[PDB]
Nucleic acid binder design. Structure first.
Lengths: 91, 98
DNA sequence: AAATTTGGTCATTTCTTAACTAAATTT
DNA sequence: AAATTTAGTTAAGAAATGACCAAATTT
């Protein structure tokens, strides 16, 4: 049912799959703890940068550098994909 | 002075290591693993939406966790997320968060 | 009873897009 | 040498934005 997931180990050394979203939650839950109450700023543009980069990396690995195929595979116009690569200096 | 915290470490999930020692790793890495695993299952099946797919998995939690923080306050949420109040509303409607 | 937030339109921008190139590159 | 990819242009369609406001609410 659930396609984007990550392996997790438990007390009894049983590896078991968990939805990526569950990690994203934890990641923040922690981030908020760290902050006492220091107003947050561009949390979106932060999380994006944190997700886009792994994603771009992987499809530009799975398509072995093929931007034309990479774009197709993600559903975004090639030119957009170029903009993002440029945006993290992945070109 | 203050020690450096690289953007990688600003958002982190905890993991057990080789020596059964708990430690934070960047969120990036969870995202990598999730795709590395997602491809492995794919086996030549073709993909088209992978961005939206990823985005939807990530946005839900963010909206979710921010709205708990601001205790339902949209004006606050959208401000600390750094987006328009109107789009935050749009996204929230999209993910059935009402 | 003030102050804030919600919800909702509206105009301007800014971003994404397909549709086309000619060049470089893979096949 | 033909087919595919790249690195661009364009235009035009879509998404995001701040600025409003009137109502609902929270202080």
């Amino acid at each position: 049912s659930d396609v984007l997931t990550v392996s997790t180990v438990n007390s009894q050394d049983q590896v078991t799959q968990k939805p990526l979203r569950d990690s994203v939650k934890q990641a923040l839950k922690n981030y908020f703890a760290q902050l006492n109450g220091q107003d947050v700023n561009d949390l979106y543009e932060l999380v994006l940068a944190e997700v886009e980069q792994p994603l771009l990396d992987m499809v530009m690995q799975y398509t072995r550098g093929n931007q034309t195929r990479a774009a197709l595979m993600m559903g975004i116009n090639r030119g957009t994909l170029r903009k993002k690569l440029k945006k993290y200096g992945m070109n």
